[PDB]
Subunit: 226 residues, 4 copies
């Protein structure tokens, strides 16, 4: 149990990668707060809303006395090629997938600086690195997450805070032919599992990654290698 009594916030924690990661942190002894739009302690939070994010962190600290680890993972996938992507759809993805990471990072960092250290893992993507047809707002957001991660690592690295991104390929959580086409882009010959992303998050959040800072860890079966 590598996370005994560590206080962890997982955003987007009610499903998929977030749920697998919260479950893994609980298994390893952490005190976990799950934040999501809807249903470990659950706290409803719109990560695009600064007051809700501040309240999330404040409540966590009031309940447990500290915040050790933030996994800023909330995100939507609701996208289109640009000619079909309307402004409200673009903005919703930027709000949640990029601004939400800024907000969660900002208020986690304030708390961690007051403690003399902490660890952040941001949810990036293969699409922090490469684009794809129809993946317009999501790629833009995830590219921003990568760069945000890097600047934070530079500013807060010297202050005993590490900030890294996990960058998943496609995860099994659609038409058969659409699914086989996705599979064909991953050299390992299958999609990932959510627990496989969780495992990487726990590595980055742990002292096993004590000199890993500002890095993107691709969990993508080889997708970005080609």
């Amino acid at each position: 149990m590598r996370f005994k009594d560590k206080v962890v916030i997982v955003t987007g924690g009610a499903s998929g990668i977030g749920e697998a990661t919260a479950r893994a942190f609980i298994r390893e002894g952490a005190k976990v707060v799950i934040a999501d739009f809807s249903d470990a302690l659950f706290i409803k939070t719109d990560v695009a809303d600064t007051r809700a994010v501040q309240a999330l962190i404040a409540r966590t600290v009031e309940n447990y006395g500290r915040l050790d680890i933030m996994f800023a993972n909330a995100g939507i996938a609701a996208d289109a090629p640009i000619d079909e992507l309307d402004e409200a759809a673009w903005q919703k993805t930027i709000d949640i997938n990029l601004t939400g990471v800024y907000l969660c990072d900002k208020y986690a960092i304030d708390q961690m600086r007051s403690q003399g250290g902490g660890v952040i893992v941001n949810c990036g993507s293969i699409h922090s690195h490469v684009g794809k047809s129809g993946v317009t707002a999501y790629a833009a957001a995830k590219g921003g997450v990568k760069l945000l991660t890097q600047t934070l690592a530079i500013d807060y690295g010297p202050q005993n805070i590490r900030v890294n991104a996990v960058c998943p390929g496609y995860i099994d959580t659609i038409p058969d032919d659409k699914k086989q086409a996705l599979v064909a882009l991953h050299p390992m010959g299958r999609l990932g599992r959510a627990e496989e992303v969780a495992n990487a998050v726990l590595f980055l959040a742990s002292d096993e990654a004590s000199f890993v800072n500002g890095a993107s860890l691709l969990v993508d079966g080889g997708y970005t290698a080609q």
Copy 2:
């Protein structure tokens, strides 16, 4: 004169890189529309405002009959380390430097698809690639611009549209010691000139770059090489 009678929009065109680029396109025979918040045809445009962007492109087409080249360059630099960066400052940079590029790209692409082709150059940055202390919102925005550029190249590449990013280092356009510290990060031993960025933009916008698509062209004296 490589751009005789080509219709070009330059956003952020009233100063710095935008002004140098507009001037270069005019010298090479283009019909240029300069768009900026304030004072070639000038059209006041808030690039964060979808109706103003639509009107910019509509007016350009009404005046000149077509749009051949868009340089989506508007941007602000008004930033801080995250602990000092308030939400309104973050949002203003995301709005202008990222959403403004989406808007300009979106409505340029609609016009170019109706013509059977065109060329976009987006203004990226060294900070599409690397972070820097205190460069929080700007890095996030520019990282997003890079990825947006890549997806557009993938979606619209097959439709005779090329989309690339120019990625400048620091350009001479501050305390002496701050300036020498910036200079020290550029292996060529000086900051760039705006006309040097313009030259790259014209290359990417030209048929000399006819198989260049989805690419970032670093104009940074070596900054990102180390």
Copy 3:
């Protein structure tokens, strides 16, 4: 105890990162073969010599039955700006740091294909990604290791083999030169060999079961700026 009875080769195993990595694998239950130019079973091996590399792998398989994990880590640092870098110095770095990785990877992959799977961790560097003054042959070698890692991941990913690279920053293993190196790492210190070992064990483990073709930077922020 993530590596109980797993058979591991660590090249460059007699010092620094290789030494720490072998010790870490031993702690976690592995049967470890250490390979190096000179002094866990130790087998003296010149990684630039194909007959030696083949013999290393054959002897590991003869002793322990199989080869689960290869950490291809041997490497020299003896470099110069190009105007001062002699052809023999260039060649020696390429031979050990790049061709040595090809050879170790090639013959590990033959065994891994035969036995139905396995895992390779190549030792890259920050200099798989960024150059630096006076780091000419070593950067070329490490850039090569990164791309080699990627192609291998693509070819052998479908064959139950994963191939990844660990990419260390500067590791503490002339005060003013040291402080200059430290100033390039945002975390404010050089890395430890043990920290690189930790990353190797992650990449070699079933915790990294969908990590393939990746470079994991262990650099305190060096490449982030």
Copy 4:
């Protein structure tokens, strides 16, 4: 006419990209020396042989007085998945595609330093950035060329030399194999040698006066996805 009386060497100059590049430089007023294993002055040169490379550069300087631009482009494509890639095939690709670039760059830089400046364009590849099935030695070589380019830009950038890499996708120079390659390029066709030449001339020109240490992809979108 951007290159009036500029002295240029193009290695691998007898065909494809090298040929197109030399022709483009000649159109624009340059004095061009073409170097290749066999057939603008032509000088037969094995780029993997240091004496030959030194002789190439010396003869260019003796004939024309100086060396303004080096396009280090020689390169072979003869590769295989690692399990099929013999040591001699690996070595030949490394020798020509990586060590050849080191040698051309080294002796160009000596001349350029002596004369007070100059410009180098190295031929990288999409495979300086991404791997591909069966592209083992060539990807390693090209990854090496990218990092070599970066270190050179750092060391020699302050000395009025710029060093950059052009990185072509597949260039049209077995229908089903061709269509598969084409499907990987979003623009819907393979590139032309002339399109790579255009990028070389840009990077070699004063239009690229602040471009240093960069890789310019000429790939129709290949690496973007």
